[PDB]
Amino acid sequence: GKALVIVESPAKAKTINKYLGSDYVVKSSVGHIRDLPDERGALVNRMGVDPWHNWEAHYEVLPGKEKVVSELKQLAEKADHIYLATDLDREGEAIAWHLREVIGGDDARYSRVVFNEITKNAIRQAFNKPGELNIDRVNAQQARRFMDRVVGYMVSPLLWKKIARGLSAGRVQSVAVRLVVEREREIKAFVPEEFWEVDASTTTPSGEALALQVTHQNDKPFRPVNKEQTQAAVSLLEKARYSVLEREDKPTTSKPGAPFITSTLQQAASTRLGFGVKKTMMMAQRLYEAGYITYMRTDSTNLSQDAVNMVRGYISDNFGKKYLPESPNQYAAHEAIRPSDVNVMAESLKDMEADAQKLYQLIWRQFVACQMTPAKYDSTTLTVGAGDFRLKARGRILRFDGWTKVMPALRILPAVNKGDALTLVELTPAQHFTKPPARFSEASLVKELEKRGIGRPSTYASIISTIQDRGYVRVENRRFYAEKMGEIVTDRLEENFRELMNYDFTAQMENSLDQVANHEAEWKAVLDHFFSDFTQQLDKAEKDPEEGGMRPNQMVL
């Protein structure tokens, strides 16, 4: 009469099993078990969903999954209750749904356990008050896959006939590419502008060196545009008398960032560790399944009181009172990506390759740092007057490292009083040129997608990978480049699928899927509205170019 517990991977099973008594029998589904394969029976067949028949779906068991199916049913009868312990997100919710449909039986036999980490306490609480499968979330998850399937299978064929065979269309992927093609064109059309800067080396009364940057000439910002203007300014600066007009000494602080969420974890892992989005999410996943960190698909910077209290204890013991804030820091109930146990160091992780330990370390330090006091600096700003010019010297000295103490080990302005005379040693004119917009990176793109409300913790990685192996954009030197085909398709889609390509409408769809997940909308009605708009767009696109249809990629003579 033992209880059955189902998870989606052997790894999770392994870990969760350590915290489940003998009353439980943990089993992995090993994959999704089941999923998908003016109406056209053949189109509907390929899609596995019927837009013209109220979104009737045809879910099939994946290859070689019937064995696992019969393995679960068999274990299901022997169990008095079935616990679907899939991941906490919608996809996890849908997988749980599919397992229940297959294994069949009374709904009362099923509980949906949710937990953001696989630890003794988290599993305890998760299995103490088991919840029910949330059909709204399942519907929100299926609504998403149905529309993605629709766009994919209905827009792609049009692309094959108008542009090229094999091209793919993606509800969100095409919008993502659009961001890259837009950036590509801003860069292409950028005309670098020349501007100059003049730095001045001076000596304080006490003989110390003081590097100054000219900021103003005649109270207006100093922005010479060419060599002649710079020379004229330089010959004036060469004869001027330098003196400190203002000495601004102010205490400043730097606060630690918020604990990681999916998008910032990917950004930081990419910038600091050079890790790609896929690599990061793959390692993050293994760390989560091994019970080392909380769920890695989140956009919440929340930290549980237990997590906060465990880290504050670590900070007090290992860093001291001055690094412990009066009260815990709170940022912006899911959780941030943090270690499951702060006392587990990156070096102590079992069966994790070097890079996964490094990701853990990144996550660990960010988590610890986020609960530490601010770093304190004594900032100094010197405003120097030189005839009609004003020069600036900015300095900074660390007064208290605070949170930076958990980060790896790492300009001193000389002492000058206002009114002091400075001696000019040398003037250095430097030619600069405005730089075109930076190219999207592994990080900055997810960030841009997060910013525009387009992505989603559990889609960022997928979106980034999907737009790459299909000839639209390519990553070179850890940077995105839009391919000719990416621009060609993006122009076609913007012209004939404007609503589908619109950033706001795309962000709004995410809101609409969230409305479904929160019982504020009904999935089929949301799918109907989407399909209505979609088909209207699609019908015009299929027409001849002279009818306002999509332009073929021909270059007629």
Ligand SMILES: Cc1cn([C@H]2C[C@H](O)[C@@H](COP(=O)(O)O)O2)c(=O)[nH]c1=O
């Ligand atoms: C994995 C996955 C998650 N999700 C999400 C988005 C939501 O932020 C998250 C859980 O949100 P919820 O608590 O509002 O239901 O699940 C999808 O929409 N599709 C997916 O494939």
Ligand SMILES: Cc1cn([C@H]2C[C@H](O)[C@@H](COP(=O)(O)O)O2)c(=O)[nH]c1=O
């Ligand atoms: C300036 C900037 C850099 N980055 C990144 C991406 C890379 O991780 C890193 C640049 O390093 P890289 O040249 O070695 O690739 O910083 C962003 O993600 N956004 C930005 O706005």
